[PDB]
Amino acid sequence: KKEKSPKGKSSISPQARAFLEQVFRRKQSLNSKEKEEVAKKCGITPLQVRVWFINKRMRSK
Numbered sequence: 001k002k003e004k005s006p007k008g009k010s011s012i013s014p015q016a017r018a019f020l021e022q023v024f025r026r027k028q029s030l031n032s033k034e035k036e037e038v039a040k041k042c043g044i045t046p047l048q049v050r051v052w053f054i055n056k057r058m059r060s061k
Contacts, residue, residue, distance in 0.1 A: 002046055019043040020056050028057065
């Protein structure tokens with residue numbers, strides 16, 4: 001749904017690596033479902049899961 005959450009201010013708590021840690025730990029191919037399902041349970045967002053995982057999971061592009 002995405003209501004209102006930029007989450008763009010310098011950086012995030014240790015969760016940055018922790019949240020992503022368990023995220024990339026659960027699997028690798030985080031799809032639109034996992035990107036949204038993972039972003040809401042891990043602490044990311046539909047906009048982050050893509051850009052965030054890009055650098056934290058640069059698979060292709």
